[PDB]
Amino acid sequence: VIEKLSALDIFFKELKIKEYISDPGFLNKDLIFGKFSGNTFLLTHPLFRNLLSLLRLFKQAIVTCPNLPLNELLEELFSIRNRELLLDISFRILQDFTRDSIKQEMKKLSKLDVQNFIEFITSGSTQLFQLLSLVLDSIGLFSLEGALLENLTLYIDKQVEIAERNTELWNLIDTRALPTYTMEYLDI
Amino acid sequence: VKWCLIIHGGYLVSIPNLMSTLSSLHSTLKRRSDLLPRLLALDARLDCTINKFKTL
Amino acid sequence: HFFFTDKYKPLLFVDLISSNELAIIERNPLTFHSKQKAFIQPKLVF
Amino acid sequence: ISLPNFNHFSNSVSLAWSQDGSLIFHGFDDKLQILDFDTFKKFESLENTKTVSEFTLDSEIQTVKLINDTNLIVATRTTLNAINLLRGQVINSFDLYPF
Amino acid sequence: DHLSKIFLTISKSITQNPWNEENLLPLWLKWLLTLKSGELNSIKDKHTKKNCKHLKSALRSSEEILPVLLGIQGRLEMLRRQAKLRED
Amino acid sequence: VAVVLELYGNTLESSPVLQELMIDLKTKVRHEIHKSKEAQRIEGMLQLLT
């Protein structure tokens, strides 16, 4: 396999022509050299060089990349492309790294992007709301706009009421003889 | 507790051992939050049967 | 042709009050006035 | 206490203990960790000889066992790998997919 | 079964718009449930129940959302109090 | 209480006193709703201050 990769069964044939539990189990038993030479097959290897991966397949990395640094992940999240990448990379960062690590990363991160994202979320998801908690904790309590505070306040108020009655309706969908005289009829 | 945290938040930021100094508070509020969701489910069941026998 | 109803097992008097008003006089013996204190024989329900 | 909060959940978790108690191996799904015991933080080496504590693996890690302070055998859901600890060099590997 | 068809349409629309700020559809739903839940359950066995589990999954996601949201609500309130103390 | 009501649904209607017992139960459990939600807000600013 190493010789085939350097000169470049289904994956080896595809690599030769171009030049996954079964695939990782047959191609992971050298690996660093193969990955460097490679840098489809790359997606499978990522399924099976953190700076290179960050600079780089985008969805494949953001879902299944083994090495992924906080700074580049927060930059990619803070891009305003918004192709559901907000949920995807919020899930990815909460799956990969710790609360205090994200806190200190956002401490490093500039406040202008923080304000931009507060505006974006207030204008137009529990991972996202956890990220909002994290970013408020990282910005702390001193530097933050009162107007943006009030916009986020009304946003969060309508959101808490919608979540409340949503929970109520969720649980809701989760859910003697004849009297002293009766005025009765009869057939024939 | 709300006013304490409001008027002395910075000292709590400066202190190194927040868990070590508010473990008891944390336990109380954590158990209250854990009570929350089942309580709301109970509320939904309640007002369900409430309105049910109020209309009938 | 004829008919017979089983809707009235307890009944004391059947008659015609008027041309088309029947009267059926029934009982509610145990459920209303006696209310007798009876020996407990519980049912194993589970 | 080391208290991460990971959104995902996978019970494929294991830990091994260095015989001197300095470090703890943690086999987590598709990841190997080595945690310093003095503070429950990552195994930081000032010399930076690529003896890192974040090792990627193909499948969910089932077992991680150190036979001594030098040899570590890890068995993941598809294979098994024997590696050195003083030097980050792999020695042996065998398959679990056929069986 | 006109009420059943209304239920079907309401459930489909609610699933399509889980975060709709309107309340008329939820309130119609909750009256309909608190009145005729049993006959609802006895109507159908496959498609209505599959839609029910879809919507219930969405609602459980919303319930998961709720507590962090309340926490940030408290964050906003305490920041407001901090601003009040700042201006005083 | 949930199982007792799920069994004795219509008897709640037939018996009048149990209805207002339920009413005060609703009032107090809404009070506890407020307590628990304020506790969740407590969660929020403690997680901020830590």
PDB file of C-alpha atoms in Angstrom, chain F:
ATOM      1  CA  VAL F   1     -50.661  13.551  40.862  1.00  0.00           C
ATOM      2  CA  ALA F   2     -50.293  12.843  37.143  1.00  0.00           C
ATOM      3  CA  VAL F   3     -51.341   9.223  37.494  1.00  0.00           C
ATOM      4  CA  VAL F   4     -54.165  10.057  39.905  1.00  0.00           C
ATOM      5  CA  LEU F   5     -55.575  12.570  37.418  1.00  0.00           C
ATOM      6  CA  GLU F   6     -55.021  10.245  34.449  1.00  0.00           C
ATOM      7  CA  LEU F   7     -57.182   7.727  36.285  1.00  0.00           C
ATOM      8  CA  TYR F   8     -59.795  10.067  37.809  1.00  0.00           C
ATOM      9  CA  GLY F   9     -60.235  12.562  34.954  1.00  0.00           C
ATOM     10  CA  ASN F  10     -64.028  12.945  34.829  1.00  0.00           C
ATOM     11  CA  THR F  11     -64.499  12.384  38.561  1.00  0.00           C
ATOM     12  CA  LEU F  12     -62.552  15.638  38.879  1.00  0.00           C
ATOM     13  CA  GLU F  13     -65.491  17.233  37.081  1.00  0.00           C
ATOM     14  CA  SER F  14     -68.130  15.423  39.129  1.00  0.00           C
ATOM     15  CA  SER F  15     -66.554  16.359  42.482  1.00  0.00           C
ATOM     16  CA  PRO F  16     -66.549  20.147  42.974  1.00  0.00           C
ATOM     17  CA  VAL F  17     -64.067  20.541  45.832  1.00  0.00           C
ATOM     18  CA  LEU F  18     -61.288  18.665  44.024  1.00  0.00           C
ATOM     19  CA  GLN F  19     -61.561  21.242  41.243  1.00  0.00           C
ATOM     20  CA  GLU F  20     -60.558  24.169  43.461  1.00  0.00           C
ATOM     21  CA  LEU F  21     -57.934  21.983  45.111  1.00  0.00           C
ATOM     22  CA  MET F  22     -56.563  21.637  41.590  1.00  0.00           C
ATOM     23  CA  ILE F  23     -56.898  25.407  41.109  1.00  0.00           C
ATOM     24  CA  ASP F  24     -54.696  26.242  44.081  1.00  0.00           C
ATOM     25  CA  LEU F  25     -52.347  23.485  42.922  1.00  0.00           C
ATOM     26  CA  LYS F  26     -52.050  25.234  39.551  1.00  0.00           C
ATOM     27  CA  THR F  27     -51.377  28.565  41.253  1.00  0.00           C
ATOM     28  CA  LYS F  28     -48.634  27.200  43.493  1.00  0.00           C
ATOM     29  CA  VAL F  29     -47.038  25.188  40.703  1.00  0.00           C
ATOM     30  CA  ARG F  30     -46.913  28.326  38.556  1.00  0.00           C
ATOM     31  CA  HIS F  31     -45.193  29.998  41.502  1.00  0.00           C
ATOM     32  CA  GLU F  32     -42.681  27.139  41.443  1.00  0.00           C
ATOM     33  CA  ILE F  33     -42.424  27.607  37.665  1.00  0.00           C
ATOM     34  CA  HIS F  34     -41.282  31.157  38.343  1.00  0.00           C
ATOM     35  CA  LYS F  35     -38.895  29.960  41.060  1.00  0.00           C
ATOM     36  CA  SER F  36     -37.325  27.363  38.760  1.00  0.00           C
ATOM     37  CA  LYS F  37     -37.006  29.782  35.843  1.00  0.00           C
ATOM     38  CA  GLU F  38     -35.365  32.363  38.091  1.00  0.00           C
ATOM     39  CA  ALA F  39     -33.049  29.533  39.167  1.00  0.00           C
ATOM     40  CA  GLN F  40     -32.226  28.995  35.492  1.00  0.00           C
ATOM     41  CA  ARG F  41     -31.396  32.699  35.261  1.00  0.00           C
ATOM     42  CA  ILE F  42     -29.188  32.091  38.306  1.00  0.00           C
ATOM     43  CA  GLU F  43     -27.484  29.387  36.242  1.00  0.00           C
ATOM     44  CA  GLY F  44     -26.943  31.985  33.551  1.00  0.00           C
ATOM     45  CA  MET F  45     -25.166  34.666  35.487  1.00  0.00           C
ATOM     46  CA  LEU F  46     -23.170  32.202  37.598  1.00  0.00           C
ATOM     47  CA  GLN F  47     -21.860  30.617  34.408  1.00  0.00           C
ATOM     48  CA  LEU F  48     -21.038  34.163  33.335  1.00  0.00           C
ATOM     49  CA  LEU F  49     -19.207  35.038  36.566  1.00  0.00           C
ATOM     50  CA  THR F  50     -17.202  31.791  36.543  1.00  0.00           C
TER      51      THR F  50
END
